[PDB]
Amino acid sequence: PETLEARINRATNPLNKELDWASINGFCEQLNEDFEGPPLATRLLAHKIQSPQEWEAIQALTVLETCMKSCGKRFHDEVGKFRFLNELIKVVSPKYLGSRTSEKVKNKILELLYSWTVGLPEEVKIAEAYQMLKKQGIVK
Protein backbone atom coordinates (compact mmCIF):
# COMPACT_ATOMS: atom_id res chain seq x y z
CA PRO A 1 0.00 0.00 0.00
CA GLU A 2 1.56 3.26 -1.21
CA THR A 3 1.29 6.05 1.33
CA LEU A 4 3.66 9.03 1.29
CA GLU A 5 5.87 7.22 3.77
CA ALA A 6 6.24 4.13 1.58
CA ARG A 7 6.72 6.22 -1.52
CA ILE A 8 9.45 8.38 -0.05
CA ASN A 9 11.16 5.30 1.38
CA ARG A 10 11.30 3.91 -2.12
CA ALA A 11 12.27 7.19 -3.80
CA THR A 12 15.21 7.83 -1.42
CA ASN A 13 16.27 4.28 -0.69
CA PRO A 14 20.01 4.13 -0.09
CA LEU A 15 20.06 0.85 -2.01
CA ASN A 16 18.75 2.44 -5.24
CA LYS A 17 21.45 2.03 -7.92
CA GLU A 18 20.04 4.98 -9.87
CA LEU A 19 17.37 7.62 -9.48
CA ASP A 20 13.97 5.87 -9.24
CA TRP A 21 11.88 8.22 -11.35
CA ALA A 22 8.69 6.22 -11.11
CA SER A 23 8.77 6.52 -7.32
CA ILE A 24 9.92 10.16 -7.30
CA ASN A 25 7.15 11.23 -9.67
CA GLY A 26 4.61 9.13 -7.79
CA PHE A 27 5.45 10.90 -4.56
CA CYS A 28 4.91 14.30 -6.20
CA GLU A 29 1.63 13.14 -7.81
CA GLN A 30 0.33 11.55 -4.55
CA LEU A 31 1.10 14.49 -2.26
CA ASN A 32 -1.63 16.77 -3.68
CA GLU A 33 -4.26 14.03 -3.64
CA ASP A 34 -5.04 15.00 -0.06
CA PHE A 35 -5.52 18.16 1.99
CA GLU A 36 -2.94 17.02 4.56
CA GLY A 37 -0.56 15.66 1.93
CA PRO A 38 1.73 18.67 1.44
CA PRO A 39 2.62 19.10 5.16
CA LEU A 40 3.27 15.38 5.57
CA ALA A 41 5.37 15.36 2.39
CA THR A 42 7.43 18.22 3.70
CA ARG A 43 7.96 16.67 7.13
CA LEU A 44 9.12 13.43 5.53
CA LEU A 45 11.37 15.27 3.09
CA ALA A 46 12.93 17.38 5.82
CA HIS A 47 13.96 14.26 7.69
CA LYS A 48 15.41 12.46 4.61
CA ILE A 49 17.39 15.57 3.56
CA GLN A 50 19.11 15.59 6.94
CA SER A 51 20.38 12.02 6.56
CA PRO A 52 24.09 11.43 7.21
CA GLN A 53 23.85 8.99 4.31
CA GLU A 54 24.57 11.16 1.30
CA TRP A 55 22.77 9.21 -1.43
CA GLU A 56 19.66 9.18 0.74
CA ALA A 57 19.88 12.99 1.19
CA ILE A 58 20.67 13.53 -2.48
CA GLN A 59 17.70 11.46 -3.63
CA ALA A 60 15.43 13.32 -1.19
CA LEU A 61 16.67 16.62 -2.59
CA THR A 62 15.82 15.34 -6.12
CA VAL A 63 12.33 14.50 -4.97
CA LEU A 64 11.97 17.99 -3.43
CA GLU A 65 13.36 19.69 -6.59
CA THR A 66 10.97 17.62 -8.73
CA CYS A 67 7.88 18.38 -6.66
CA MET A 68 8.72 22.06 -6.51
CA LYS A 69 9.10 22.31 -10.30
CA SER A 70 5.44 21.39 -10.63
CA CYS A 71 2.37 23.55 -10.12
CA GLY A 72 0.73 23.49 -6.73
CA LYS A 73 0.10 26.41 -4.39
CA ARG A 74 -0.22 24.29 -1.27
CA PHE A 75 3.06 22.41 -1.64
CA HIS A 76 4.88 25.52 -2.76
CA ASP A 77 3.57 27.34 0.29
CA GLU A 78 4.53 24.56 2.71
CA VAL A 79 8.11 24.49 1.45
CA GLY A 80 7.94 28.27 1.64
CA LYS A 81 7.46 28.30 5.43
CA PHE A 82 10.33 28.66 7.87
CA ARG A 83 9.02 25.42 9.38
CA PHE A 84 10.53 23.68 6.34
CA LEU A 85 13.23 26.12 5.30
CA ASN A 86 14.76 25.91 8.79
CA GLU A 87 15.33 22.17 8.18
CA LEU A 88 17.31 22.93 5.00
CA ILE A 89 19.26 25.68 6.74
CA LYS A 90 20.40 23.28 9.50
CA VAL A 91 22.02 21.16 6.77
CA VAL A 92 24.07 24.03 5.38
CA SER A 93 25.05 25.91 8.55
CA PRO A 94 28.26 25.14 10.47
CA LYS A 95 26.31 25.90 13.66
CA TYR A 96 24.06 22.90 13.01
CA LEU A 97 24.89 20.06 10.57
CA GLY A 98 27.00 21.89 8.04
CA SER A 99 30.43 20.82 9.22
CA ARG A 100 29.44 17.16 8.76
CA THR A 101 27.55 17.48 5.46
CA SER A 102 29.13 16.99 2.07
CA GLU A 103 29.61 19.97 -0.18
CA LYS A 104 27.54 18.10 -2.79
CA VAL A 105 24.48 18.10 -0.53
CA LYS A 106 25.04 21.60 0.76
CA ASN A 107 25.55 23.19 -2.67
CA LYS A 108 22.50 21.39 -4.04
CA ILE A 109 20.41 22.97 -1.31
CA LEU A 110 21.85 26.47 -1.93
CA GLU A 111 21.23 26.26 -5.70
CA LEU A 112 17.71 24.95 -5.12
CA LEU A 113 16.97 27.85 -2.80
CA TYR A 114 18.31 30.34 -5.32
CA SER A 115 16.24 28.79 -8.15
CA TRP A 116 13.09 29.16 -6.06
CA THR A 117 13.84 32.85 -5.36
CA VAL A 118 13.80 33.34 -9.16
CA GLY A 119 11.00 30.95 -10.13
CA LEU A 120 8.68 31.55 -7.18
CA PRO A 121 8.96 35.22 -6.16
CA GLU A 122 5.68 35.03 -4.20
CA GLU A 123 7.33 32.75 -1.63
CA VAL A 124 8.88 35.70 0.13
CA LYS A 125 10.20 33.66 3.08
CA ILE A 126 12.35 31.63 0.65
CA ALA A 127 14.00 34.85 -0.43
CA GLU A 128 14.36 35.97 3.20
CA ALA A 129 16.06 32.68 4.12
CA TYR A 130 18.39 32.99 1.12
CA GLN A 131 19.25 36.59 1.95
CA MET A 132 20.13 35.49 5.48
CA LEU A 133 22.37 32.83 4.05
CA LYS A 134 24.24 35.44 1.97
CA LYS A 135 24.63 37.87 4.86
CA GLN A 136 25.88 35.08 7.08
CA GLY A 137 28.36 34.17 4.37
CA ILE A 138 26.98 30.74 3.39
CA VAL A 139 26.11 31.83 -0.12
CA LYS A 140 29.47 33.00 -1.45
Partner: peptide, 7 residues
Protein backbone atom coordinates in the same frame (compact mmCIF):
# COMPACT_ATOMS: atom_id res chain seq x y z
CA UNK B 1 4.93 29.22 11.27
CA UNK B 2 8.19 29.07 13.19
CA UNK B 3 10.67 31.95 13.36
CA UNK B 4 13.50 31.90 10.78
CA UNK B 5 16.41 29.86 12.21
CA UNK B 6 19.26 31.56 14.04
CA UNK B 7 22.69 30.51 12.62
Amino acid sequence: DEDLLHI
